[PDB]
Amino acid sequence: AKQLTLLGFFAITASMVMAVYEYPTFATSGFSLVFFLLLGGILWFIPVGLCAAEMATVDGWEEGGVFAWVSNTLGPRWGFAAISFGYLQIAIGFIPMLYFVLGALSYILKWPALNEDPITKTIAALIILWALALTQFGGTKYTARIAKVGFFAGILLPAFILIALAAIYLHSGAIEMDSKTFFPDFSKVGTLVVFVAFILSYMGVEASATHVNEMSNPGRDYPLAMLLLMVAAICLSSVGGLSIAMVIPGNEINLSAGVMQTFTVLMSHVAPEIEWTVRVISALLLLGVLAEIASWIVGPSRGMYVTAQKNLLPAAFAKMNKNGVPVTLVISQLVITSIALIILTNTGGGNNMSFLIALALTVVIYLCAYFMLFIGYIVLVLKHPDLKRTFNIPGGKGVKLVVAIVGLLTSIMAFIVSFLPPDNIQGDSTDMYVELLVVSFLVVLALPFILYAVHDANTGVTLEPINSQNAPKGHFFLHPRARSPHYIVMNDK
């Protein structure tokens, strides 16, 4: 007995439709971004959600996450490594936040040294990270809550204030030319590498797929959620990613504090009288992000305990303190994020390069997890056709293949394109982009593959799937990339 209206689903993963942080670096590509979101959604997004779902709704596969899906078609070795890119990609994916944080931070305090100064960013980055790390440790009773209050408060609220700020400003006066800048210049070197920010925008969906089952009539109900979710995300990202763009042109947009910058600019027009108001908006931005980050600190390692229960994970990488919160991982990833935070930022050209690079690294890591999803999916399609699926991509072995084949392509393309800069991401220069990024990525691709062989007597607890019904307060106000799916019921609780 399970019923989930198409809108019920939308509401659940609708939470990702908002990626303000990256709004600045979507703007760098001027007007093209509507193009780019179109690709993303049609060639990637969709396909991803399409295949991910069919795999989720398979007899015995609902409780998996593509540790499940993959480990059946591509086999074990592949599920562990693939499922580790749900967790790994997020260690790097943190950077972006920390920068956005410091960017807002800086604008609040008339301290443009928080963004600019790399030496100060690092020290300031960890301070904020390992602080949140602390709090979260104090049990995750709160997270969910704060997040529901936070994302409301901050990520949601400024958006209205931007639309209204940009829209009214566009009313009269004046910066990017809307006519035909629509297509990126394949004329120039770095033109694509931006995609990264756009693919990132869509990654995550695989999370809320299994949510399919509870659904009520996957058939249409579902390809529609996507159609609407994709359209909604494009509209939100298009209106925002552009606002900033209209009032700052491509060369000098600040990647991290780029958002607050747009407000300070658009405001200095509405009536300098309330120019300070912008400072207040920054506080809300930093708040929303802080809440979203704090929710990440704990979550995806819980997502990743399934590997431990199967021994897969080291004998030492399995322990939770009164109230769950397995800590070997949480504290472990924190080091990777901290160690990486001291490498990327405190290293290359300036800042814009450190921000954009962080996205590529996170996207590249996630790409690995996806490649298997598409590859294994086709294995499913073709090696296990006689099987039990609640949701079936609608068309036939054909559409199914061509659909899955397309997405794999889009990924690949995103993977490559990830690796060639223009050398000029608004000043800071990618002289060191392609390398640091090769050694950084090759360094990780390396982790889950080594842990496997390393070594092959059980203990832990039970994990209880979560559903449009359990679901702690305001889970879904969370990002899909990061929600875990199940409570660490130890002591039975």
Q: How far is CA 402 from CA 96, 197, 224, 369, 393, in A?
A: 34, 25, 19, 20, 11
Q: Which residues contact 493 (CB under 8 A, 6 or more apart)?
A: 487
Q: Which residues contact 451 (CB under 8 A, 6 or more apart)?
A: 80, 312, 313, 314
d(CA 457, CA 314): 12
Q: Which residues contact 174 (CB under 8 A, 6 or more apart)?
A: none
Q: Which residues contact 253 (CB under 8 A, 6 or more apart)?
A: 24, 25, 27, 28, 244, 245, 261, 426
Q: What share of the chain is helix, strand, coil (3-state, %, to 5)?
A: 60, 0, 35
Q: Which pair of tokens denotes residue 357?
A: 């690079």
Q: Which pair of tokens denotes residue 199?
A: 């693919």
d(CA 111, CA 99): 14
Q: What is the resolution of this structure in A?
A: 3.2
SS3 of the chain: the string is: CCCCCHHHHHHHHHHHCCCCCCCHHHHCCHHHHHHHHHHHHHHHHHHHHHHHHHHHCECCCCCCCCCHHHHHHCCHHHHHHHHCCCCHHHHHHHHHHHHHHHHHHHHHCCCCCCCCCHHHHHHHHHHHHHHHHHHHHCCCCCHHHHHHHHHHHHHHHHHHHHHHHHHHHHHCCCCCCCCCCCCCCCCCCCCHHHHHHHHHHHCCCCCCCHHHCCCCCHHHHHHHHHHHHHHHHHHHHHHHHHHHHHHCCHHHCCCCCHHHHHHHHHHHHHCHHHCCHHHHHHHHHHHHHHHHHHHHCCHHHHHCCHHHHCCCCCCCCCCCCCCCCCHHHHHHHHHHHHHHHCCCCCCCCCCHHHHHHHHHHHHHHHHHHHHHHHHHHHHHHHHCCCCCECCCCCCCHHHHHHHHHHHHHHHHHHHHHCCCCCCCCCCCCCCCHHHHHHHHHHCCCCHHHHHHHHCCCCCCCEEECCCCCCCCCCCCCCCCCCCCCCEEECCCC
Method: X-ray
Q: Alpha-carbon Rg of the chain, whole angstroms?
A: 22
Breaks (C-N over 2.5 A) in the chain follow: 174, 456
Nearest to 292, CA basis, from 49, 22, 66, 56: 22
Q: Are 411 and 44 in contact (CB under 8 A)?
A: yes
Q: Are 258 and 244 in contact (CB under 8 A)?
A: yes
d(CA 490, CA 262): 48
Which position has the token pair 């100060």? 120
Nearest to 128, CA basis, from 331, 256, 294: 294
